Amino acid sequence: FLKLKDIVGSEAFQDYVTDPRGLISKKDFQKAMDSQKQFTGPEIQFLLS
Amino acid sequence: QWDRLVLNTPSFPSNYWDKFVKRKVLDKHGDIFGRERIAELLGMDLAS
């Protein structure tokens, strides 16, 4: 929960972010986490939850 | 600012002997900032 703050601050994940409101979809979030590679699959599922 | 000109040139490491500089940079910073972005910055083509 510190690395997630860092990642949301990061611009690479904001590239996956597309909605003008700034809210991202579940699939886009999953893809952005996978691209960053900081989190493994189970972790990604947890932060999605 | 001037060095920005040489990043994507094919022969950037002409005098310095380390010929794997671009590959090392790509492997080091590809994940966080994007392999495609790094390759575009350094003028290298992974498909090629």
Side-chain angles (χ1 to χ4, degrees):
Chain A
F1 274 73
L2 294 177
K3 258 154 83 136
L4 168 142
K5 167 81 82 86
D6 128 77
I7 290 268
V8 68
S10 177
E11 299 326 290
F13 151 90
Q14 262 167 313
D15 271 331
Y16 275 88
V17 177
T18 58
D19 178 338
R21 308 279 70 86
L23 296 52
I24 205 188
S25 66
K26 263 207 195 46
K27 283 303 320 303
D28 289 1
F29 187 102
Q30 213 268 333
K31 293 207 264 63
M33 296 327 78
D34 268 309
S35 73
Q36 294 251 3
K37 313 270 299 315
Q38 304 299 116
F39 307 101
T40 85
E43 329 199 314
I44 298 173
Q45 295 330 348
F46 176 82
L47 319 89
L48 276 182
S49 325
Chain B
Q1 306 295 138
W2 186 252
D3 281 354
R4 220 189 290 265
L5 293 195
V6 82
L7 298 177
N8 58 284
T9 64
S11 39
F12 151 52
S14 275
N15 280 19
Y16 184 44
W17 36 65
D18 187 29
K19 304 301 185 227
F20 301 115
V21 62
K22 276 159 176 182
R23 270 185 20 201
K24 291 156 135 216
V25 169
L26 177 86
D27 296 346
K28 189 140 176 321
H29 306 274
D31 301 340
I32 302 284
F33 302 76
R35 297 242 316 176
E36 280 328 334
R37 189 194 260 90
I38 294 315
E40 179 234 33
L41 179 95
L42 295 187
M44 62 210 294
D45 162 344
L46 309 324
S48 79

